[PDB]
Write a protein that binds this DNA or RNA. Sequence first.
RNA 1: AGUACGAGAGGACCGGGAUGGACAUACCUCUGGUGUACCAGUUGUCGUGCCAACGGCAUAGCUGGGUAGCUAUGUGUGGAC
Length: 116
Amino acid sequence: MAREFSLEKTRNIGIMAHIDAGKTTTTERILYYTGRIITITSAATTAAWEGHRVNIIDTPGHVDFTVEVERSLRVLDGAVTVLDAQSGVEPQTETVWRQATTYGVPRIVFVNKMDK
RNA sequence: AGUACGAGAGGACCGGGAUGGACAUACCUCUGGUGUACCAGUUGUCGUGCCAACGGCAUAGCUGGGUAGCUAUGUGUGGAC
Ligand SMILES: CC(=O)O[C@H]1C[C@@]2(C)[C@@H](C[C@@H](O)[C@H]3[C@@]4(C)CC[C@@H](O)[C@@H](C)[C@@H]4CC[C@@]32C)/C1=C(\CCC=C1CCCC1)C(=O)O
Ligand SMILES: Nc1nc2c(ncn2[C@@H]2O[C@H](COP(=O)(O)OP(=O)(O)O)[C@@H](O)[C@H]2O)c(=O)[nH]1
Ligand SMILES: [Mg+2]
Ligand SMILES: [Mg+2]
Ligand SMILES: [Mg+2]
Ligand SMILES: [Mg+2]
Ligand SMILES: [Mg+2]
Ligand SMILES: [Mg+2]
């Protein structure tokens, strides 16, 4: 009938980072918070945050699996680049950053592992 | 401590615990073995005059169990600090 969320409230985002940076943990926490008033599977997951629809795609970090990053950045609108606090930008962080730049995807950086 | 290291794959030193193999030793409470003067079942035959009950011989006649002792495959202990 009528779409439950308008175009102005849609966010198609991908979580990308170097290996072990915390993409899966971040996605799990995001899903938990959006679902409270968690198994991560499938290409994309749909959730709601503050009246906004959020499609999340969690990407792999290894350079061996750059296909997933490519095929996700192709269809995504925004990206969250996760950085390990102790090491900052790492080689696969650079690789995913260049892929996002090639696809012209806006990015927000998130420094995870501040407690480490 | 998935820490140091490592692009990644992977992946520690040092330290702290648990639990084994093999070996040694003591020991029989347990699990089992043996257990020829323990209990019981049973065949053939000869006896105790006969019935009943018993004895001899047949590998301890054979068979099912089995005390102590002696025992391992069983139970403790050791090579720690
Ligand atoms: C985000 C996510 O879920 O990544 C998953 C999904 C993932 C990207 C996977 C790695 C790999 O198997 C991938 C390939 C390319 C494998 C070949 C084909 O089967 C294709 C169709 C297949 C597509 C995707 C797939 C299944 C993931 C992954 C990495 C696993 C980590 C390892 C560390 C050493 C051992 C491996 C992860 O957990 O990050
Ligand atoms: N100390 C700490 N560990 C984290 C944090 N986020 C994730 N981790 C852990 O670091 C590892 C990161 O792996 P994962 O989240 O799967 O990351 P991915 O490789 O980017 O998908 C896992 O062992 C997590 O438990 C964080 O903020 N702090
Ligand atoms: Mg992951
Ligand atoms: Mg004994
Ligand atoms: Mg005894
Ligand atoms: Mg005679
Ligand atoms: Mg008679
Ligand atoms: Mg004779």
